[model samples]
Target: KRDLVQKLKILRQELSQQQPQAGHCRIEVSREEIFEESYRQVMKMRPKDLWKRLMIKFRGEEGLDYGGVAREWLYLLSHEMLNPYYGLFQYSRDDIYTLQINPDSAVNPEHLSYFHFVGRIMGMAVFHGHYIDGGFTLPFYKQLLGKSITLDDMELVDPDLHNSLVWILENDITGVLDHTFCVEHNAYGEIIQHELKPNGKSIPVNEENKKEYVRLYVNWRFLRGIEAQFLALQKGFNEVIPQHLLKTFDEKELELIICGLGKIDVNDWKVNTRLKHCTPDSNIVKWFWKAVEFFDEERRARLLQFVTGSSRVPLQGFKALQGAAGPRLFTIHQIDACTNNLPKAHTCFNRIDIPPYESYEKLYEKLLTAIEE
Candidate 1:
């Protein structure tokens, strides 16, 4: 172990010596061996101060620790153990070592199969302003951190009924919709129409294809739901129209308005609405009406409520509407729900108060006990 540490010190020195020269020399070493050493050292330290010690040791006296490469190796060996692609260390013929951790290497192995479903529940709680009752246990987190060993581990789980959910989580809906729909608007930012481009040519919006357009629009809103919720939470409903629209409009009319509004030039409106002398009654209301005129009096009232937030829609109403919208729509709702739930779980995890140790000896004893477990 001392020899290994001395070799690492020498390697650090050689790299430092070559720093002034452009592409001077390369030294090679076994990445797994280095990671193992780092991991052993970390396991010997107190959990609360592990990060600090690791950072100090890897940084060295000259404040140059192989370009902070050891930190990446430490993460891979410790927290990122579930990641399958572990071959990160590379060495050249000149005996210079370079770290090459893959961009996609750290994706949670249980993300698509298990966490996706779990996250939906968490996300739903965010929008509904409710607390998730369970499933945020240490054992649950242990699995997420790849520390647990069980026969039915999510690492071995396969995509089943929730494959669409997984796909939606993996990609943004905007990219998917761009393939099928094209937005057209006038110079003044009034939306002319949404056109279908199924065959690589613009086609007029007609009764035959209106449902498809509405479907896509609803999906886009669902995809944007978590973001919308976050914005609403950060800055109240009065600040953003979409957040207001979400709270006030009937579910059906809200869906249609979102579709109609999508055709408008939001970029132009964003610029015009922010001018020095602009009033809320001017460009904002005008843009609102452009989308509103597509529906009737009852629908218009719902739209009005959406903007004002005077008569806020209930959470159950949103839930009922989401469930009735069929699988694709429900899938997005679930995704947003998961997005909300995750942070809530994190907050809960942070609130867990562990027993404080009186001394370093006691802390070390606790760590040893944990390791034995």
Candidate 2:
């Protein structure tokens, strides 16, 4: 026999109203040993985890990262990492400072694998909605898009070579320029011949075959001998952000999205800005605008980067600028002359702390110091 008893039980529960956060990555790197430390440690983590939100910690720096320090970290890291002296990349032969991957980058197994890491950094830049300002030429983006390299595509990378090839097609060069269907590259100190097609060394460049020669030459210049690096880059990038997401946009469109607007619209920035503790007609505010309006594009860009973590604005103008919470107006909070002598930026919040200096000259000096440092 079972006795049925009606029992009512109430459990006391203590619940804290703290918000639960998603998984994030913590990258602790020394500013001095950034390049070596970043790459070495970054390899230890899974790519999927690397794609998560980051918590940056610079060794020995007590400052908390509200996304500002990390922004500086990426900029400085990319600046040194993408430098041509590393033998991973090089500048164009043209006068322009456009960068492209070095054709002969495979010095050893270690260096060959570095491209994948570099590519992941690039993926992070786009995924995190930041820019590194690597100055990669259009050709680099095209390759990532899996677009074919053409004769015209070489214009920015090798303007002289492109022109010479065009000259070859324009005029009848029976004996003017004599060459085989091969490109000779200087390796170490010796000249090595790279045949465009099978038995390309034997093929002569005549009127009928000149077009074919140009096509082959362009392909060899941009595509050949860099297969390992390109594939590794593509692999790392795809692991972070899939190929289909990128394939939707054209090369230039992708560049704009990743790079942001090339030129900062000062007028757009000026009109969209909001002020705190200062009126628009105030002398200090007027002086600030005056100094900015007179500044060259480069200086303005630097100033913008100092305040916003990016030198460029969105396509929808400053109206779409994002902040810690949501769309934030580029706000300037005025501080009295004594408080925080130099101008300070809260990059995460999209605000700058401008001081109430005695004169425009004094303010300008402080502004320059803040941006440059």
Candidate 3:
């Protein structure tokens, strides 16, 4: 314990000494700037006359709710807005239609299918022609002869739409709609594979799967699109917006922008948990506490070291876990036992070592095999 403390203290001093240059700090871009720029760009690119025609055709009928519609639009626009820095949609096929590579790479198809559903809804929300009873109308082929159709009708036509729409409809947290709104099918084959149970039923989409869907969608659909949109907006703003208000990024400015992208909030509970476990002792706590006290150079260097696991900056040398108190002390018995337990599930690393089985029984069998081995 004493050795651990000494090593930790030395590491803390080294960390302080190795701080990066002050001017290397990342730039802080505003959410408002990104969103407004995206909106401006979309308006510029899409035709105004199409909107005028829609307004004329739908005179008395209230159009699809633009405010609700704008949320998905903004989310997508924001994604395009942020693409370049992250290298989301790199050029493919002569740049006419770029494929999403970075964000969508190795992603689950069903999950992508889910967000594509959301995108389709967003497209319909902004551009769909008519509405009935608070839901958008289906294309002529999808509508029923006598019955009043809801937004679900339009969605039923496309399988991708059917899957997501059913999932959303069944799981609409708003609670305004009931199971009656659950359309099993209409002109299209099967809107949903199953029905809502009497008591209540979870949708076919698993909770974990839903989270995975959102994570992939936000990174892929939302963030990637925003990145692209932002670069375009930046270019347009340079051409149109005043020079003084919008400074062209020099090398230093570019560095700052990169910095801003990298400034992940350490305040995240998971991060704090990691910090606590990774360095329980030493002046590391003090470093975090006195973060504002350090020059930007120090902070940047330390942060870079933390992030990169190495840095050119100079700093004191102390073990993060056990500062200069000498080597970690442990009982020979403990070391022997730990070594004997090496191949057990807890001791192992990598997904291959521990297959992700959905069944508890399967997982137990796996763990048992690992420990026995």
Candidate 4:
């Protein structure tokens, strides 16, 4: 097999020439091998001081060891293994990977199959890595680094989301809305609408069609549930964050939150509202209802009274309204103000190089070398 260097060169050439063939392109590389290469590349590119600071400040205290990329890898591994049932069954791993590599394929625009699903996950993971890095190093006056930080930090720390939103505001909010709306429209077309019938009922759907419909229905409902929860989460954040956490934030903290807010995929309402029942016992709905159930029994009446608006906030799960509120809208102005406040060095994080592109054949060759390496 051709080595990585040769393969990379070939891939670069092919990409430059804009040519590729199609099929189930299995680049004989293990997932683990690709992950390792990704890890090494990240570590080599990452700044030493930043890595050290993350390690010293957040490692092994609250929950995870912030031991840089290694720790990140471990967290990812555990998360995947632990929550296999949540969104795992929605699509196969290989299908997910395929979607990741060729998301724009005319055949599969919105992640139809298992490969697309996993590919999207992998792509998001990779993107999330950069976002996390950006947020933690905002260079704000007050260091809000948590000792043993939870996954919550990953969402709030990234400022680019905010910045991008802010940019949209300054330029064209309508255009931004239009773009997201288009994507959402396409997504809906790909995954929505399911027909359910009794076993004896003669429905138009065939056996195969019926199975696909069921799968789509479950997936759609799951996603919708997640979005519904996010609304409650936002409400919770509004109620709690301001009163409890705002005082702790400096300008940098504010900037980070603002940026993070801007970055949110408001269009990806499906992910936000979907039900994640990967694990049998760990269903979010189950956990949420359990809390409500405790309140109902008068066991935690006082806590519930203080938290939910009264002696009763309804034990039933937070059902989203028929046409729920659109995810919190962020203007480009807000993002711009936050990013503009940052120093030059803080923005240096954006200078990272793009990974090389590869046609299927070139990617396959690189895969062989990548595996060997």
Q: Relative to the true structure, how large is the alpha-carbon lDDT of every model?
A: 0.28, 0.71, 0.29, 0.27
Clashes of each: 14, 0, 39, 34
Task: Quote model 3's TM-score.
Answer: 0.19
The Cα RMSD of model 3 versus the native structure comes to 25.8
C-alpha lDDT of residue 92 in model 1: 24
Full-model lDDT, candidate 3: 0.29
Ten residues in a row with the worst lDDT in model 3?
343-352
Q: lDDT: which is higher, 3 or 4?
A: 3
Error of 1 at 286 (Å): 39
lDDT of 2 by residue, 8-124 (tens): 001001001111146666778898888778887777777767666667878888655447666666666665677787788886676234667787787655875688878877777
TM-score of each: 0.17, 0.67, 0.19, 0.17
Between prediction 2 and prediction 3, which has the larger lDDT? 2
Off by over 4 Å in 2: 1-35, 45-109, 185-190, 204-208, 223-231, 274-278, 294-299, 302-310, 314-373
Arranged by TM-score, best first: 2, 3, 4, 1
The per-residue C-alpha lDDT of model 4 at residue 274 equals 31
Q: What number of backbone clashes does candidate 3 have, counting pairs of residues 3 or more apart or in separate chains? A: 39
Sorted on lDDT, best first, the list reads 2, 3, 1, 4
Candidate 1 residue 208 Cα shift, in angstroms, is 46
Over the stretch 218-244, how does candidate 4's per-residue lDDT look in tens digits?
A: 333323323332232233222212223
Cα lDDT tens digits for candidate 1, 1-373:
1243343345335433423333311222244454344434433433222212122233223334543433333222322222223322122223221111222322435223222222222222222222221212122222222232222222222224134333433455443433345544352355555443455243323433434544443333221212322222223211212132233233333222211111222233233222122234543234333443444444433332222211122222222111111111111001122211211111111111113333434433432333221
